[model samples]
Target: GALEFSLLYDQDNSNLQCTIIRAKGLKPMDSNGLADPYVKLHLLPGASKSNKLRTKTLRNTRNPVWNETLQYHGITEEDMQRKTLRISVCDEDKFGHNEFIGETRFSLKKLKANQRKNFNICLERVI
Candidate 1:
């Protein structure tokens, strides 16, 4: 299934603010026998190739982590971005980065309208 979330600007105000989050979630149960998992956040709809976005990775203890928060400030800048968020989680073993365990997408609407929504996707090893 595919999920979508939005960060919206007020109906009357074109201005807005938000933070995009990216995190690495790899563990014994969630990981594919790998020690490290690589996580990447793609700006929904993509960003200007020239613009540099921030990325942060961290360790988690048997829990889901939301470590990446990218802020888009100013309502005038709202036009600069649209509703779209794509996240990719990968593990590079001898298998390389061929394994994609989980992924989810969110629209910027909820973020823009001062609403908090929590949607999650995860990996589970099957016995």
Candidate 2:
């Protein structure tokens, strides 16, 4: 109901690499009932606003697949164990504010070290 993606934590470079690969079974929000899908990535412990990032919009699709990758620097493996990764899927509106479709949070503390983690994250309400 949410999305699927991959994450790789590079212990050597202290970089957190994420790829927003695809989404499925989404509900459209536009009047024409199609979504202009994109995903937002947030790395958190506090509101480190500079860590916020987003993917390029994929127009008019309920299921969108993107090959967008974002690399965040300075998050060491030890530090990552204390952080959380927040992901939001939204519909980009041509004329108004974007629509929030779904979201999930990954507790980095639970992630395996020096390996790729592939997840089919479940969606949750914005509250």
Candidate 3:
């Protein structure tokens, strides 16, 4: 399975915008062989509430389209140089807890100011 997304940094404002575009070939995690999926984002080195964001859940689909953008404010260039983004796709369960499907990480340093960088990478197991 793979997750598609993009990142853009506003250097002047010290903000970062992350767009959760979609996902494909996701692992099924429900009894009906489908999953209610959602994408979650976290900033590493400090996984606090302010650095977390999530997309709306899509019902009963292995392939989900989000196209939702989440933002982080007051992100200095020094923070970007030292931080990493953790993106995870999960199966939401109403009766129980959400289940982890797959995830990937990207270093914020790879992004150039004002330039949107797109990624469509395969999901990796938790290590």
Candidate 4:
């Protein structure tokens, strides 16, 4: 509920790509201290049979900068009226599943596209 942006639909091609930004509160990034950490994007109100929209790994990639604009080809914008965003961050490790850290929730109405105006998404371990 902190941001907003306009998105145009292109019938010929993918409309726009969304990028998720990971950073320390008010900071562009976490000091080297927070190593090998990645966050997964999940559409909320529907986290039961799997929550994350894209399970593909998003590591070493800060600025989510969704290279492939989220696919809204079939679904109409109005259908997204009840959509919500849920984010979960975990410590990255190769041997097995990552360690769960924290989670946050937001709304799709707050998503922005090509946010060229100094906007960033920040997540952290919930205390």
lDDT of 2 at 126: 80
Query: Each candidate's root-mean-square deviation in Å?
Result: 6.5, 1.5, 1.3, 6.5
Error of 4 at 14 (Å): 9.4
lDDT of 3: 0.85
Which has the greatest lDDT?
A: 3
Please list the residue runs of candidate 3 whose C-alpha ends up more than 4 Å from where it truly belongs after superposition: 47-49
Badly placed stretches (over 4 Å) of model 1 are 1-32, 48-54, 58-66, 73-81, 94-98, 122-127
Question: Best by TM-score, which number?
Answer: 3
Q: Kindly list the per-residue Cα lDDT of model 4 for residues 1-127, writing each as its tens digit.
A: 1222223333334232334443342222234433354545566565356544442344554333223223443333443446665655555646655455456665655543323222334345565
Q: What's the CA error at residue 1 for candidate 1, in Å?
A: 12
Scored against the true structure, residue 98 in model 3 reaches a CA lDDT of: 66
Clashes of each: 18, 0, 0, 7
lDDT score, candidate 4, position 126:
65
lDDT of each: 0.43, 0.81, 0.85, 0.43
TM-score of each: 0.47, 0.90, 0.93, 0.47
- Give stretches of model 2 more than 4 Å off: none
